[PDB]
Design a protein around this ligand. Structure first.
Ligand SMILES: O[C@H](c1cc(C(F)(F)F)nc2c(C(F)(F)F)cccc12)[C@@H]1CCCCN1
Ligand SMILES: [Mg+2]
Ligand SMILES: [Mg+2]
Ligand SMILES: [Mg+2]
Ligand SMILES: [Mg+2]
Ligand SMILES: [Mg+2]
Ligand SMILES: [Mg+2]
Ligand SMILES: [Mg+2]
Ligand SMILES: [Mg+2]
Ligand SMILES: [Mg+2]
Ligand SMILES: [Mg+2]
Ligand SMILES: [Mg+2]
Ligand SMILES: [Mg+2]
Ligand SMILES: [Mg+2]
Ligand SMILES: [Mg+2]
Ligand SMILES: [Mg+2]
Ligand SMILES: [Mg+2]
Ligand SMILES: [Mg+2]
Ligand SMILES: [Mg+2]
Ligand SMILES: [Mg+2]
Ligand SMILES: [Mg+2]
Ligand SMILES: [Mg+2]
Ligand SMILES: [Mg+2]
Ligand SMILES: [Mg+2]
Ligand SMILES: [Mg+2]
Ligand SMILES: [Mg+2]
Ligand SMILES: [Mg+2]
Ligand SMILES: [Mg+2]
Ligand SMILES: [Mg+2]
Ligand SMILES: [Mg+2]
Ligand SMILES: [Mg+2]
Ligand SMILES: [Mg+2]
Ligand SMILES: [Mg+2]
Ligand SMILES: [Mg+2]
Ligand SMILES: [Mg+2]
Ligand SMILES: [Mg+2]
Ligand SMILES: [Mg+2]
Ligand SMILES: [Mg+2]
Ligand SMILES: [Mg+2]
Lengths: 125, 170
RNA sequence: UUUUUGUUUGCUAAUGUAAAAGAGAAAUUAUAUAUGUACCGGUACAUAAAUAAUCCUAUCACCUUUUUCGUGGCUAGCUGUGAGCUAGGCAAUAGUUCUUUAACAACAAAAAAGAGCACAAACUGUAGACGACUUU
RNA sequence: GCUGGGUUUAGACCGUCGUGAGACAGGUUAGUUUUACCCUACUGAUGAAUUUUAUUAUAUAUAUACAUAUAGUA
RNA sequence: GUCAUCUAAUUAGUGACGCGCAUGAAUGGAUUAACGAGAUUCCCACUGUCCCUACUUGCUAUCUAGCGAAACCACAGCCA
RNA sequence: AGCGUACCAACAACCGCAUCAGGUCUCCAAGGUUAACAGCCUCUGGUUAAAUAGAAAAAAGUAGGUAAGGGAAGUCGGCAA
RNA sequence: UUACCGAUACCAAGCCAUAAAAAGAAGAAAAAAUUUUUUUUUAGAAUCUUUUUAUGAGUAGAAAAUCGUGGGGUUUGUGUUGAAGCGAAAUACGUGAGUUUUCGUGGAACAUCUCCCUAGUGCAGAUCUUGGUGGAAGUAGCAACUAUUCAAAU
RNA sequence: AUUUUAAAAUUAUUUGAAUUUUUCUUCUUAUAAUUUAAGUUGUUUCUAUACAGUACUUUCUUAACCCACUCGUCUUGAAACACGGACCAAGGAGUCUAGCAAAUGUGCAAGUGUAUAUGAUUCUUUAAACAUUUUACGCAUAAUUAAUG
RNA sequence: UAAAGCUAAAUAUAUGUAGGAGACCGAUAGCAAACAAGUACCGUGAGGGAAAGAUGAAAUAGUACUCAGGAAUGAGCAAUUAAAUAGUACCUGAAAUCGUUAAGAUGGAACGGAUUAAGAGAGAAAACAAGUAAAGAGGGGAAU
């Protein structure tokens, strides 16, 4: 169903899993669009998996906002942190998965100085 | 070993690397054993070796006969897998020895983890039909055995509600 | 059986309900008639005839004072319970609702009180692939 | 399940047809019948489990489903 | 195919008959003793071929100890 | 002078994909019964092993036996016996 | 004769895309505090932004926008305070391919979305190839060669 | 950041009319306010005086109501008693060159392309890049005819 | 100027050796062959023709010793290592498949979609508290 939280509307919380991904191991859940005659999914018979479609898309205005209402920005370095000094209420930092612990700590510190939210501050904490 | 132990001081482990016994029979034996005092398990094994008590084949029960001793485990099928049993007995003995070497009482030891994994098959050749070579492989096993010594929120409104409920009850 | 608290190494305290909010209701029988009652299926007289469109059962808290009547226990009195009458004026306040935590059943702990079979094994053979059965 | 006599392989003979190889809805004879250990079905053979499950009553004329029922063997 | 014959009964067999769809003379024709793991029918003997199945023996199957494959397999597996 | 000389010759030493009831050339050749180097049994020599044992002794199978009275009535056909 | 139920059709409203259409090269608003501080923003990216309306089936096919993989030039970075990978995930983002992140393993490399350049560039099928692994299944079976048994030894 | 304006409407006034004589009677002269304009804001709780809990989010898990036939494939038509597929991992298929074409980009444009090859103060990259002698040829600028033309 | 001949240069090279290269391939790729590869093995023969790399920095650290074992192996209070679930089948160790544990479900399939539900995990970056004050631990920047 629909998942209103704030003004943030999500139309389809459920992932669209590949047809029959649940039937053969060799078929991953990653959406693939079925082709060929007699698909059932293509044909949209009641009771099957749904086909992702453009109707499902989120309002242009709230799109890439997370539950926080801030667009997520990936941060590898202090230099990168800096573009968001004038944007602390609109973008929220995520520190790159590959950052070493000291560097991560430094980044976190910087974020606090800036008043910018960190979505993954706790890595290696 | 596979089990979550926490304190290995009250535990005694024993392993069998690549046993020349069938995986299924051995598995069954292990199942039969599981959750038992070590000595009792040993006794059971001995009995099975001497064809007095059977091990119940419940999982791999395809074609296994229909013994008299199976009534003991509420089952109908059961067998006396000799070589496998012997192997298991040996491992049990080893475990016991290990325990002794530490400081665990053998009377209070229970088998908490009796795992049988299947090892890599020993390849042999069988000859069939119209000049056809087929695999005549064995089903070897690893056996892992572990013995072990065995002996918010308040909320003011919520609180008020609770009180009211209590009053009502009274 | 009663009471109390709980069920907020694989374990060694322990939860689940397709359905509680009064889940209230025992003639029978006919459907172009029934039911009683009283005599000898018959006769006479009642009675239901939108029959659950009804009837029953609810809220009288309190404790104390003046009691009456019913039921249950023990040897006319005592006690407990239920119902009425009379006197005292007394209490609940949660700040506007967020289920009315109120039922049933199971348990687990705490205290309290009371008070052997079977399989196997050997044997059998009225049986039988093996179980099983029949035996001892 | 079988049998394989015929039909419908390769051998062969005859008749007709075809220059011929061959043809015949013409005749005649000789010509390998593979696998269940799977699932179900059936026939027999054991056999646990079964409280949202049961109950045609029980109990001393009155009661009671706002009730009984443990389980294990036999 | 008609008459015989064989049978209680014969689309078989044998002996005849013959305007023979379409027999026939080294495409050899007709006849043949002996021979044939040749094709066909009948008779005698003989028998579980059968009436009509029964009992029995080894070896398997069966259960156990040991070992231990494969074809096949979308998922699977009750019916009207 | 040189070269060959072990051992196997199938039973697991060879060829059959294998320690596979198959195949593979030659010589020697005992007593009994007998026409017989047949078949049956024995001596010399050789084994007592064969990709398994044990227990039960159903069906079914397979290699056999035996069946009263009938005697091919079975079946394509006396196939099999 | 009414009443009602009843579609992804219809209507009303939102949002998504597509198509078209309007239209576009300068400025303080409010709240909270106590007249001054604090809190938010203070827009102008032409395939872009704002708004408007209509529309949305689809095999063969065509096109566009994206997404990912191996390498290259460029750009600015991450690594033994642990890279790639792998396994599980995640109040995660995307309609989706995916992307990103956390924990665990791992023990050495790894990116580029800044632009675009190149390719042996994306798999569920081919009685696909190779390697592995199952159910069948502890099942079929281990039945030619007449046959073994007792004691002892190692 | 001026079409959340202008008007409509409404409220209390102010001037003039009207026949529908009317505490919503209408126009209209002027002024303030308001919303019926000019797409929902307010009040009171609660979460909660919490850092995660049994609440709240979300992943998984079964249930339950309703629905749902093996995908790929050739086919008028496949769930088919049509074929392929036991399962999994990796590999696995419109490519490259020659010439032509249109499309579009770019440079130049009656021209254009420096072909081979030379030259250099070019030499890790340098097998590229640069340079083109102090009327080459291609295609195009003219067509047409079997043809001398 | 035939019926006689010779002759360097530019030009070609998938063979051999030796150098140097790559916007090449990265152990099912690349030669068939990264390794005792034209090797093992198969075919009477002409011929056919594989699979197979990686422990660690260092085996001049390759498992000492003790206990149980016939032995393999196992275990350790022991031992090399940074690391032995790096133990020589040794880097990473996916999937199928299987084992252990737990939870759950189960009247002739299972799975699935839509929508909840109860569980069981997870979580705080919207899912309350800016600032102010007292005093600790730090860090800065500036003024002179
Ligand atoms: O069109 C103006 C404009 C001017 C100038 C300038 F003159 F400086 F080059 N440059 C502009 C640019 C620029 F060219 F990129 F600078 C973009 C958009 C608008 C520009 C806009 C007008 C609105 C305010 C911003 N400048
Ligand atoms: Mg179709
Ligand atoms: Mg189909
Ligand atoms: Mg025939
Ligand atoms: Mg023929
Ligand atoms: Mg006859
Ligand atoms: Mg005749
Ligand atoms: Mg003639
Ligand atoms: Mg002859
Ligand atoms: Mg297989
Ligand atoms: Mg010799
Ligand atoms: Mg000798
Ligand atoms: Mg032989
Ligand atoms: Mg050979
Ligand atoms: Mg042999
Ligand atoms: Mg007879
Ligand atoms: Mg006779
Ligand atoms: Mg007859
Ligand atoms: Mg007959
Ligand atoms: Mg005969
Ligand atoms: Mg469309
Ligand atoms: Mg990468
Ligand atoms: Mg390709
Ligand atoms: Mg694949
Ligand atoms: Mg496909
Ligand atoms: Mg394969
Ligand atoms: Mg349905
Ligand atoms: Mg067709
Ligand atoms: Mg086909
Ligand atoms: Mg198939
Ligand atoms: Mg395949
Ligand atoms: Mg692939
Ligand atoms: Mg062009
Ligand atoms: Mg010359
Ligand atoms: Mg290779
Ligand atoms: Mg380290
Ligand atoms: Mg590891
Ligand atoms: Mg390494
Ligand atoms: Mg490893």
């Amino acid at each position: 169903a629909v998942k209103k939280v704030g003004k943030i509307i999500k139309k389809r919380t459920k992932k669209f899993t590949r047809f029959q991904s649940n039937r053969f191991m060799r078929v991953k859940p990653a959406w693939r669009k079925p082709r060929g005659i007699d698909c059932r999914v293509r044909r949209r018979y009641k009771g099957t998996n749904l086909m992702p479609s453009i109707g499902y898309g989120s309002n242009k205005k709230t799109k890439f906002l997370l539950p926080n209402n801030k667009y997520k920005y990936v941060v590898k370095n202090v230099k990168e942190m800096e573009p968001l000094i004038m944007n602390h209420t609109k973008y929220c930092v995520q520190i790159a998965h590959n950052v070493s612990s000291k560097k991560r700590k430094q980044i976190i510190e910087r974020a606090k100085q800036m008043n910018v939210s960190v979505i993954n501050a706790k890595a290696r904490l | 070993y596979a089990k979550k132990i926490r304190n290995l001081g009250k535990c005694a482990k024993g392993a069998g690397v690549d046993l020349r016994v069938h995986f299924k029979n051995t598995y069954e034996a292990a199942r039969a054993i599981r959750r038992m005092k070590l000595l009792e398990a040993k006794k059971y094994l001995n009995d099975v070796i001497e064809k007095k008590r059977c091990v119940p084949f419940r999982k791999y029960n395809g074609g296994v006969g229909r013994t008299n001793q199976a009534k003991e485990f509420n089952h109908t099928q059961g067998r006396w897998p000799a070589k496998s049993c012997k192997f298991l007995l040996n491992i049990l003995d080893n475990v016991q020895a290990n325990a002794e070497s530490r400081n665990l009482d053998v009377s209070k030891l229970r088998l908490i983890h009796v795992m049988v994994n299947k090892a890599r098959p020993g390849r042999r050749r069988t000859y069939k039909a119209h000049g056809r070579i087929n695999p005549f492989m064995s089903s070897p096993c690893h056996i892992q055995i572990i013995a072990r010594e065995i002996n918010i929120s308040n909320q003011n409104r919520l609180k008020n509600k609770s009180v009211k409920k209590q009053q009502t009850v009274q």
